[PDB]
Design a protein around this ligand. Structure first.
Ligand SMILES: [Cl-]
Ligand SMILES: [Zn+2]
Ligand SMILES: [Zn+2]
Ligand SMILES: [Zn+2]
Ligand SMILES: [Zn+2]
Lengths: 377, 377
């Protein structure tokens, strides 16, 4: 290969500091060390969590860094000892790793692998405690183990899902986070049963994916809740049977939902990251057995609260990370389901833009004027 | 029968007002109206719930009233249309009713029947909205649908569990409340699996029952947690493998428990009603899949809080009411289980006293000098 074993100079978007626009400029990407994989990113999308860290809300936020964690690409080279993938393989980098041997990888009800979290959480690589990006010789740190806002990135082997080489990379990049999180909140965390009632709070990409999955699970009623009523027609397209703007109501939203359903919904999902709405979703879960799943990411430190009477009388409060999917095992299964024509994945992409317009994609996201923007180089 | 269809004069303990001793004296017990059952109480125990209302802490407390909700006895007569029991049947009256027809009775995961609670919550009967006790013609209100501190009481048919005639009534009188609640927290709400690790916060009768049931379910470690170390020898007799006094440690108790188990306990239970301890129990449930069950009843005005990170990373917060047992269906099965020799029910009874000493029994409860005291007439 032309580039194997060599640093690569390529285009990237650098967050030099919090709460400034990103700089699209050249970065130097080192070759992969032992157990590492260098990936050519072919397509990458923006997630609310990228904006969260950019805005200074990440406790472990480390600058300068390259954000991005929803992507798909092609293996450029692998470091020493890597056997699971080879150059040319099509891959999705996974912010949730999978090693298959730790306590979490072996438990059927967790995906929270601890193989590399200590290093990806600090924006470096496990093999030497250092990042792989440099600008004028100075280190630029990784984000969420993936750093997909770069033509080339280096990731741990445990973070590399190898996918159907025939799947379109500018579509299945979405499976790297948001859509997969919403689907798995339904199929893995809540395990929604046929005939059940569901409420979804927040109608961005994650909430729509909750709706899509709940319809596939056979839900009999799906109540879409958002304070932006321009999101309602798409929610109905994905299967919502009701749409509710909390601002059209004097009562707190949890009371409105309970009144609509007498006792609450069998399942509720919070897909925003707002702790007040998290409480609301718990309190309109059905009396006696209702389950409420936190999908969104709240600002660090902020607490959720409710009266314990809510749980004593049968409601269950839980949460999910990456929809509970064991990444390297199950992300390929999600791609297969897409290839079978069973999903609406294509309908989440509202904008296809060039990487140079990345800051405009953040503005579209911040305005709620997109579901997903897929960037290409 | 000499008494059927006629009022009964019998001994009872009247709570004329809050924070005063009970008066043991004669009361008039009306015959049962439609759908009602008049029960001759053969044994009745005391519980902190009786003392809570007697101390004037209950928002729905209503005086004057006849307290008591843990009892067993024999049917003296039935009202119009009752066919599920007949005179001579041995029964346990239950504060949690079971009608078999409402949404909660028909759900596999709830026992929160709504057939009569609106009426029992106000200390009256559903058939006419009035109580069945009088002194000098003045009404005395019911408590928890049961009012078992009386030789005879009148209860809703939906509250009457029909039990094995061979069971000793001065033992199974505990199965209408705390012991069953603890057992059911393990077997119904948490569904504790063999080999799992368990922590139990609070070591009264309810927490000891959680420990007993966790051991029966095959838990490999059971960590009992209480600030009163004089409860630890009894906790070990019921199956605890470790005992932890939070006052012995200079770090938050959830950190102590997580350090002991590396990641937390697969299941944790809060058995006191203390919201700060409820949070601690949640936060030392196992990363990725741990379950924390609120069994105790918090004070009026206390919320539970945590950070949503705790749920996003796999912990599940729930609660239980009467152990999730559907009363009229499953209380007879608990009696059958006790009769099989599989339980430690007899070990919960530390005192056996005469009904005339009920005020002295409440002193023992307040002093903490007993697990359960059983009264007979
Ligand atoms: Cl009626
Ligand atoms: Zn994301
Ligand atoms: Zn692992
Ligand atoms: Zn009790
Ligand atoms: Zn019912």
């Amino acid at each position: 290969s032309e580039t194997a074993g060599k640093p690569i100079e390529c285009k990237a978007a650098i967050a030099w500091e919090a709460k400034k626009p990103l700089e699209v400029r050249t970065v130097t990407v080192a070759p992969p060390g032992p157990g590492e994989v260098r990936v050519q990113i072919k397509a990458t999308a923006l997630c609310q969590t990228d904006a969260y860290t950019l805005g200074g809300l990440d406790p472990e936020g480390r600058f300068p860094c390259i954000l991005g964690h929803e992507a798909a690409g092609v293996v450029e080279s692998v470091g020493e000892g890597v056997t699971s993938v080879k150059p040319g393989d099509h891959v999705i980098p996974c912010y949730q790793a999978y090693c298959g041997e730790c306590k979490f990888c072996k438990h059927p009800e967790s995906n929270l692998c601890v193989s590399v979290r200590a290093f990806t959480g600090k924006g470096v690589m496990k093999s030497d405690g250092k990042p792989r990006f440099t600008v004028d010789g100075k280190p630029i740190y990784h984000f969420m183990g993936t750093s997909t806002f770069s033509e080339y990135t280096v990731v741990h082997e445990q973070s590399v899902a190898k996918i159907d080489v025939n799947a379109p990379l500018d579509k299945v990049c979405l499976l790297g986070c948001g859509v997969s999180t919403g689907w798995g909140a339904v199929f893995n965390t809540a395990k929604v049963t046929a005939g059940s009632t569901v409420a979804v709070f927040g109608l961005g990409a994650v909430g729509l994916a909750v709706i899509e999955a709940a319809k596939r699970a056979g839900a009999s009623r799906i109540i879409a809740v958002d304070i932006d009523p321009t999101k309602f027609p798409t929610a109905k397209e994905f299967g919502a049977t009701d749409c509710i703007n909390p601002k059209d109501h004097e009562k707190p939203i949890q009371q409105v939902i309970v009144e609509m359903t007498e006792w609450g919904c069998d399942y509720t999902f919070e897909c925003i990251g707002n702790t007040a709405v998290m409480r609301a979703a718990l309190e309109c879960a059905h009396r006696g057995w209702g389950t409420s799943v936190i999908v969104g990411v709240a600002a660090a430190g902020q607490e959720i609260s409710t009266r314990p009477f809510q749980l004593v009388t049968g409601r269950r409060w839980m949460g999910t990370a990456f929809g509970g999917y064991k990444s390297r095992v199950q992300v390929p299964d999600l791609v297969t389901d897409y290839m079978s024509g069973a999903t609406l994945l294509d309908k989440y992409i509202t904008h296809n833009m060039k990487f140079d317009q990345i800051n405009e994609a953040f503005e579209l996201l911040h305005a709620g004027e997109c579901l997903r923007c897929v960037l290409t180089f």
